[PDB]
Design a protein around this ligand. Structure first.
Ligand SMILES: CCC(O)(CC)COc1ccc([Si](CC)(CC)c2ccc(OC[C@@H](O)CCC(=O)O)c(C)c2)cc1C
Lengths: 11, 240
């Protein structure tokens, strides 16, 4: 799926 | 034998761990309170604890040499697959064999097998998890070996969903060779005996603990009343 929170924490 | 770049790698990983592991556990005051009382009374507190730790694991992973050379997709799949395992590894720092508990600074934040049971988990996971903690503690790893093992755990090419498995392999091989050479040159016998092989065995133990945790997590998370008590990050990373 989409992982916007993990993506955001990965910068 | 330990090259300048290998020492550099270790220095980066030690600093990454120092910037992402708070041994004062001060932030635990922000979690939903632990409750020891059929109800999964420790689920809210331990969900916040796990969610917090996931954030720390991501911060550590971003500083592993080579990790940001991967695509966004591969970084995501490596962290989704590895997060539970790195949490089990890094929690060993608070684990004490004196009473087989995770001691995080105070009685309220001291966790035993009954606390994990009160988050929904069973002995199928809890007993192998305690034996893992004891076995890992008995290795008496140097901090250098502890952070190298966490980094190697994250960058494993055989994780489900990996696209560029060869690039993941190249990054891990650099860390694996750094670990093997560190043990040879810096870990004195008898503690060094078969130490690399014992550490890779713990990575195999973690895959099995990962499988069992996901099984129990899937059953627990399948009930909306339980999923309501999780965090958005836990739902994104662990599933559903
Ligand atoms: C559905 C329920 C669910 O499955 C997911 C919500 C429950 O899951 C659980 C529950 C308990 C544990 Si735990 C042993 C592994 C025994 C209480 C543990 C102990 C200390 C910890 O503290 C970490 C420090 O290291 C913090 C400083 C830092 O990490 O920076 C962490 C994180 C975990 C792990 C997980 C996955």
């Amino acid at each position: 799926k989409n992982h916007p929170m993990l993506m955001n924490l990965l910068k | 034998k330990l090259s300048e770049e290998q020492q550099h790698i270790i220095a980066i990983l030690l600093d990454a761990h120092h910037k992402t592991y708070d041994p004062t556990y001060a932030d635990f005051r922000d979690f939903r309170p632990p409750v020891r009382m059929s109800p999964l009374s420790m689920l809210p507190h331990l969900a916040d604890l796990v969610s917090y730790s996931i954030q720390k694991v991501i911060g550590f992973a971003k500083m592993i040499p080579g990790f940001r050379d991967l695509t966004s997709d591969d970084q995501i799949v490596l962290l989704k697959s590895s997060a539970i395992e790195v949490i089990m590894l890094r929690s060993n720092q608070s684990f004490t064999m004196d009473d087989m508990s995770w001691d995080c600074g105070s009685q309220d934040y001291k966790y035993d097998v009954t606390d994990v049971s009160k988050a929904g988990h069973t002995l199928e996971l809890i007993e192998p998890l305690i034996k893992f903690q004891v076995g890992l503690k008995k290795l008496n790893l140097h901090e250098e070996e502890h952070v190298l093992l966490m980094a190697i755990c994250i960058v494993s090419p055989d994780r489900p969903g990996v696209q560029d498995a060869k690039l993941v392999e190249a990054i891990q091989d650099r860390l694996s060779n750094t670990l093997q050479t560190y043990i040879r040159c810096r870990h004195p016998p008898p503690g060094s005996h078969q130490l690399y092989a014992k550490m890779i065995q713990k990575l195999a133990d973690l895959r099995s603990l990962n499988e069992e945790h996901s099984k129990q997590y899937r059953s627990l998370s399948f009930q909306p009343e339980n999923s309501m008590k999780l965090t958005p990050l836990v739902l994104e990373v662990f599933g559903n």
